[PDB]
Amino acid sequence: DTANNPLYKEAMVALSLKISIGNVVKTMQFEPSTMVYDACRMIRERIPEALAGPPNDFGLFLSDDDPKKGIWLEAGKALDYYMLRNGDTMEYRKKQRPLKIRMLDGTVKTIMVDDSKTVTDMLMTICARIGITNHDEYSLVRELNWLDHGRTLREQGVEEHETLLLRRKFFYSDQNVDSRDPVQLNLLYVQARDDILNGSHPVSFDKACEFAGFQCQIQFGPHNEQKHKAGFLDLKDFLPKEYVKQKGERKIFQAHKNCGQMSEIEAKVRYVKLARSLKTYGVSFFLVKEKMKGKNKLVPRLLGITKECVMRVDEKTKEVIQEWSLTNIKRWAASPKSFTLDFGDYQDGYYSVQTTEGEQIAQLIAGYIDIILKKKKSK
Q1: CATH number of the domain where residue 55 is located
Q2: Which residues sit opposite 302 in a β-bridge?
Q3: Are residues 266 and 302 located together in one domain of the fold?
Q4: What residues make up the domain containing 62?
Q5: How are beta strands 284-290 and 165-168 bridged, if at all?
Q6: Domain tally, the chain
Q7: What is the 3-state secondary structure (H, E, C) of the chain?
Q8: Centroid of chain to Cα 142
Q9: Rg of the chain over CA atoms, in angstroms?
Q10: Domain harbouring 315, CATH code
């Protein structure tokens, strides 16, 4: 006993994909050359469970055992581009996801963001909702450290439960301080402040105490010698980590009483103006090891990247040994061990250094160049 199936169709070319929407898994057939956006339209017209939200909030998603290699299908591409076989599962998934942002002021706010968009595009919506004009200068870090702007959160292992920090990364434009807007002024104060205690902005031990004196005027107001006795202050909250293991509390206090009856707002103005007054302002430092003719063991030094130049700096004294303008740089190359700059005709020989952060050094140089070109399309 044998039987020939009348429903047997020959020369089948369509792709039989299983569409997943929540609990529902239903099989659908698509032509190979069908665009992704037309696929979603067909899915919307044949599955009433796909009409929960508007199409812009939904997309086709290819899951993976590893969450960081899940793929959001681009609408402008075709189906067979993603190398699909009959029996493969396509998710009609919600693109929106909550992203906790600890913010600048310190309050943590939850923002919905497109899980398919890159970080450089997510930063646009994040800044638009937090009312921040200069989204080019900002970026995001992880408290366990900047993230790659050209890549999505999913492909960098950022789980959806992790909070991130909005922090300024590029220092190109700075509107000068005025106390007309106290909220934006406190925003400037927090950014300029935490860049000093973080060690991101190096200062001398004397300048660090003049800052802490202003910050005492911020959080405690005028100096009350009754309540502000010695030993009252946890120095770890008021200086870089290098300057805490020293007897420097009175210098802070003496700078604190030098403020007199200064308003909290006025002391915030002075904190920012003094920070901008330093030549180390707006300079992002990296640790590198160079090879001089003097010996065959790499001497550690710092190199700083500014809005307009790259400079070789000493690890201790923070003095500029050599500075090349970004218009003197012809090429750069990065590696998990090295970083190299070629200066064309403005120098004989390249500048090559061993470093852990050749990744970000190049990413930070190109970013400033990105900014210079962006603010120069039509002057």
Answers
A1: 3.10.20.90
A2: 287, 313
A3: no
A4: 15-94
A5: unpaired
A6: 4
A7: CCCCCCCCCCCCCCEEEEEEECCEEEEEEECCCCEHHHHHHHHHHHCHHHCCCCHHHEEEEECCCCHHHCEECCCCCECHHHCCCCCCEEEEEECEEEEEECCCCCCCEEEEEECCCCHHHHHHHHHHHCCCCCCCCEEEECCCCECCCCCCCHHHCCCCCCCEEEEECCCCCCCCCCCCCHHHHHHHHHHHHHHHHCCCCCCCHHHHHHHHHHHHHHHCCCCCCCCCCCCCCCHHHCCCCCCCCCCCHHHHHHHHHCCCCCCHHHHHHHHHHHHHHCCCCCCEEEEEEECCCCCCCCEEEEEEECCCEEEEECCCCCCEEEEEEHHHCCEEEECCCEEEEECCCCCCCCEEEECCCHHHHHHHHHHHHHHHHHCCCCC
A8: 9
A9: 28
A10: 2.30.29.30
What is the structure's resolution, reported in angstroms to one decimal?
A: 2.8
What technique was this entry resolved by?
X-ray
Name the token pair of 220: 């405690």
